[PDB]
């Protein structure tokens, strides 16, 4: 159905507000809010949202608390002031996916249309993309397991419409734009290695552990395709790619010629002025 | 080809861009179009009668 | 960027003074819905 979605920073900043108004409780469990957007267009667009109280139980995990009246009131007034946005789905700040979440989402699965689930972290220590869009659909399982709600990963992007970019850029005055050049590119070319390093290290360890040491048949079948992807590159000897390396290095030579020639052109005015201005200043000095 | 010049009925002249929705098929000149007060985008065109 | 606010000023008209007065208030001939009579700036003399 939906190929990709658009998530604005405003809702995550509303989560920052959720971490703001806490006021030192001593509980700070997962808080379920109500996300709003436009389900009319194929691509999902998030504008703004509100917050609803959500509480659970220590021992029993099947306990979930929502409000129909508050939801209908907030959505009612929001629809009253703005008719260009309606209900879509919900989201939680919990780093882990609870089993009760299917029952929590079941409500909006009944009353509302199909809802999208978003998982974020309470502490922004994650370098990767904090927002993961998960569509709720029923898929046929190959192993023959009974049909249940399955969360499928949907690609997403973080962007703003018009004024939000200005607001962010003004409030920050730190981050820099694309700015094609040396430092902007080389920073990426440096840190990206760590971007892959910490992620892969955080992944393959728990992967290796849970595969051999673990149970609850999450359908490992896709991981054979994972390993297959890892085997899609059987150590190519580059012998066929030698010509490509030759063309690339030829382009490098072109870069060399361009650089040398252009710099040689720039050196003109400098290696003229450095003489003609100095000799004239010196002779007219006294 | 991406951005062209528009002429208002009142007489001032302006310039607009291209929306990701519409294509370059009806973007060709010789056809009266419509504009928006914000960002000067184009929802659709205005066929003459 | 300090001139940027003077760009936000939405430009400036072209003044034409057909007559000067002894009250030190300069009248200016302008395009229709024009003719705004006001004293000039203090750093610039009127008689000039």
């Amino acid at each position: 159905a939906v190929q990709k979605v658009v998530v604005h920073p405003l809702v995550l900043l509303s989560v920052v507000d959720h971490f703001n108004r806490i006021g030192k409780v001593g509980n700070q469990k997962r808080v379920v809010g109500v996300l709003l957007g436009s389900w009319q267009k194929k691509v999902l667009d998030v504008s703004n949202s509100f917050a609803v109280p959500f509480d659970e139980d220590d021992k029993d995990d099947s306990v979930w608390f929502l409000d129909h009246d508050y939801l209908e009131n907030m959505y009612g007034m929001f629809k009253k002031v703005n008719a260009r946005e309606r209900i879509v789905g919900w989201y939680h700040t919990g780093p882990k996916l609870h089993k009760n979440d299917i029952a929590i989402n079941e409500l909006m699965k009944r009353y509302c249309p199909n809802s999208v689930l978003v998982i974020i972290d309470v502490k922004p220590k994650d370098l990767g993309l904090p927002t993961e869009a998960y569509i709720s659909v029923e898929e046929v399982h190959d192993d023959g397991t009974p049909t249940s709600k399955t969360f499928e990963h949907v690609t997403s992007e973080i962007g703003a419409e018009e004024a939000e970019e200005v607001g962010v850029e003004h409030l920050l005055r730190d981050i820099k734009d694309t700015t094609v050049g040396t430092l902007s590119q080389r920073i990426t070319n440096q840190v990206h290695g760590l971007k892959g390093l910490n992620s892969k290290l955080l992944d393959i360890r728990s992967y290796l552990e849970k595969v051999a040491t673990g149970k609850l048949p999450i359908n490992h079948q896709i991981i054979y395709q994972l390993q297959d992807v890892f085997n899609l590159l059987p150590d190519v000897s580059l012998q066929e790619f030698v010509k490509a390396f030759y063309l690339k290095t030829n382009d490098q030579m072109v870069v060399v010629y361009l650089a040398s020639l252009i710099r040689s052109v720039v050196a003109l005015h400098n290696l003229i002025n450095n003489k003609i201005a100095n000799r004239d200043a010196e002779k007219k000095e006294g | 080809e991406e951005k062209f010049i528009v002429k208002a009925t009142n007489g001032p002249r302006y310039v607009v861009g291209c929306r990701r929705q519409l294509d370059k098929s009806k973007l060709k000149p010789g056809t009266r179009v419509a504009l928006d007060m914000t960002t000067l985008t184009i929802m659709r065109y205005l066929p003459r009668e | 960027r300090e001139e940027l606010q003077l760009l936000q000023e939405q430009g400036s008209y072209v003044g034409e003074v057909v007559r000067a007065m002894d009250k030190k208030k300069v009248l200016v001939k302008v395009h229709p819905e024009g003719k705004f009579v006001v004293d000039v700036d203090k750093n610039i003399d009127i008689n000039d």
Binding site: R173, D174 | - | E2, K42
Partner: protein, 187 residues
């Protein structure tokens, strides 16, 4: 002793506390006994975008470099005309405190570009800096007539200037007339 403490509080998020680290390390390193502080002082001065630590930067610099009045205007010569006016203000305070009580003309001859600027802050700071020098000085040795006249013009120009401009003006004039030339200041 407190080196580790200052180094630990230098990375703090609070701009006020960031300036507090510089103000703390200011009087501690006075006497020009540490060349390490000025490194991160100038570093946080140029790199950081917030004008708070930038205007709070060279005060500690002048405090530790107060020993030699001559070397200061040379290294603050680049901070004479800066990007943001706050740096020019802090630099004006720097030239004010460093050249205070001395006969150094390196600031004095550079006071002329400083006395006139589109920004009122750097102007006021230039008035203070000009107030902290001419005090206790003979007129026959050096031509202070120019800056004295431009200082005496501040009161008649108050109508055509900013409200805070005349404030810093008469405030700068209250420095020379203080104590009737009898009392002065010494670092």
């Amino acid at each position: 002793e407190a080196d580790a403490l200052i180094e630990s509080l230098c990375r703090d998020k609070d701009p006020i506390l960031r300036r507090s680290g510089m103000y703390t390390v200011a009087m501690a390193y006075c006497g020009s006994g540490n060349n390490k502080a000025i490194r991160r002082l100038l570093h946080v001065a140029v790199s950081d975008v917030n004008d708070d630590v930038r205007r709070a930067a060279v005060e500690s610099l002048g405090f530790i470099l107060f020993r030699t009045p001559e070397q200061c205007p040379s290294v603050v010569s680049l901070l004479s005309e800066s990007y943001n006016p706050h740096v020019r203000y802090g630099a004006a305070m720097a030239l004010g405190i460093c050249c205070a009580g001395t006969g150094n003309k390196e600031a004095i001859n550079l006071l002329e570009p400083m006395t006139n600027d589109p920004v009122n802050y750097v102007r006021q700071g230039a008035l203070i800096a000009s107030a902290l020098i001419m005090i206790q000085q003979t007129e026959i040795t050096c031509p202070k007539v120019n800056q004295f006249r431009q200082l005496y013009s501040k009161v008649i120009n108050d109508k055509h200037d900013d409200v805070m401009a005349k404030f810093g003006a008469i405030l700068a004039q209250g420095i020379l007339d203080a104590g009737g030339h009898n009392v002065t200041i010494s670092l």
